[PDB]
C-alpha cells in the first residue's frame, strides 16, 4: 500500500523535529519513546534516561541502548559491504564499498566506488560491444579488444576463453540488443523494436 508521506507525529517514521516516533497511544509499544497522544513537547521525544529508540534505527536495542561498535545493522549489497553500527547513534551508517571490479548485477557489470557500473568486460580490459547479425548471441554479453570492434564476440565464445573460460554471461532482461534495434525478453530472445 501507498505511503502518505507527510511528516507527522506519528507514522512510526522519525522525521525532522522529532527524536523518536512510536505511533499514537494504542500503537506505541516503545518503552523508550513518548507516544503522539502525549502533550506537546513530550510529543515524539525520548523518555528520560533513555539513550535512543528502535524507531530511530536498527542500531538501538529494544531497551533503548545504542548497539556497540562492530555490530551488524545492514546486509551485503552487490557493491557494498555489511553495515556496522558506530556505537554513538541508532542510524545504520553508510556501508563501505566492496572492492573495485567485484561482479555486480548478475555478473553483467562491475563495482567501482561501490556503485554498479560499466561492463564485466572492463574487468579483463576489454570493452563492451553488442553482438549483431547468430540470433541467440544477440542477448549475450559480448566483448571486444579495446577500439577493435571487429573482434567483438560473446563472453561464451572460444575467443575469450582466457578471461571468461567459455562460460556465457547473458544480458539482463530489458537490455538493448542488436545495436539498439531491440530488447532482450526473459527468454533471452531479442525482440524487434520501433519508435
Amino acid at each position: 500500500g501507498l505511503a502518505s508521506g507527510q511528516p507527522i507525529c506519528g507514522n512510526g517514521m522519525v522525521e525532522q523535529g522529532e527524536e523518536c516516533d512510536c505511533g499514537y497511544s494504542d500503537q506505541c509499544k516503545d518503552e523508550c519513546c513518548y507516544d503522539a497522544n502525549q502533550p506537546e513537547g513530550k510529543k515524539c521525544k525520548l523518555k528520560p534516561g533513555k539513550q535512543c529508540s528502535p524507531s530511530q534505527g536498527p542500531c538501538c536495542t529494544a531497551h533503548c541502548a545504542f548497539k556497540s561498535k562492530t555490530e551488524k545493522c545492514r546486509d551485503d549489497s552487490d557493491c557494498a559491504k555489511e553495515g556496522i553500527c558506530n556505537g554513538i547513534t541508532a542510524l545504520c551508517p553508510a556501508s563501505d564499498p566492496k572492492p573495485n571490479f567485484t561482479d555486480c548485477n548478475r555478473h553483467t557489470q562491475v563495482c567501482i566506488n561501490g556503485q554498479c557500473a560499466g561492463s564485466i568486460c572492463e574487468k579483463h580490459g576489454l570493452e563492451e560491444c553488442t553482438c549483431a547479425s547468430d540470433d541467440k548471441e544477440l542477448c549475450h554479453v559480448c566483448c571486444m579488444k579495446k577500439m577493435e570492434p571487429s573482434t567483438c564476440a560473446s563472453t561464451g565464445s572460444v575467443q575469450w576463453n582466457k578471461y571468461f573460460l567459455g562460460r556465457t554471461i547473458t544480458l539482463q532482461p530489458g537490455s538493448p540488443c542488436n545495436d539498439f534495434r531491440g530488447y532482450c525478453d526473459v527468454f533471452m530472445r531479442c525482440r524487434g523494436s520501433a519508435s
Partner: antibody
Amino acid sequence: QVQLEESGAELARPGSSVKLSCKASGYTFTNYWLQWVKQRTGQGLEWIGAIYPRDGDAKYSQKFKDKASLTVNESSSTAYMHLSALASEDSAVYYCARANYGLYYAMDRWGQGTSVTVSS
Amino acid sequence: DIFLTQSPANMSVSPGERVSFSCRASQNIGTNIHWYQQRTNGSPRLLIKYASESISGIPSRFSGSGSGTDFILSINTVESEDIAVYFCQQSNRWPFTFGSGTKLEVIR
C-alpha cells in the same frame, strides 16, 4: 478468436511415452512463445517449459529436461510435448498456454488441458 | 528459482464484502508477477498482469497492487461466481513459478 485446442485424454503404460498436442488458431502461431504447465489433482501449477515456434528454440525447467521434449509443426500451427519413460508421478493435467505481454510474459490464453493417466 | 508463497490457504467471505489475497516472492521481482483464477474443472484465467495492470474482459472488481517482494490481489466486492482458486505467478525469471494458490469460499 484466439484458441488453443488440446488433444484428448491419454492412458499410458509405465515406461511408454505420450505425445500431447496443442493446435493454435486465431493468431500468428510463430509470433509467441508457447508454454507447457503440469497440474496434479488438485494441486499446484508447475511450469514445464516453452518453445518459440518460429525457430523451435526451447527452454526447459531443469526438473523436466529428462522428461519432456517440445516441438512444433509450424504448418499445422501445432505444438507437441512428448512425455517419456512414464511413471505414476506423471499422471496429471497438462496445459499449453500462450505467452504474451513482454518482456516478462503472462500466460494470456490456455488450452483445456489434457489428462494423462499412467497405470498398468 | 524464485519462489512464491500465498497467504492464507483458504479464505471465506460474504458476497459483496471485500477480499484480499496475498503473495510473497523470495526475492525482489519488481512488478513482474501475474494473477490467475481457476474455477472448478476449469483452465487458469489471467486476471491481472504486472501486478496492478488490468486485462480486457476481466471484471473491474478485480485489482492488484504491490511491488518488490509483496503483492495483493483484491476483489471489491465479492460475488458467488468468484468461487475459485487464485494463483500468483512470477515472470521475472524462468523457470516461471506459481504460488500454491488461495481458495475462496463464499459464505451463505
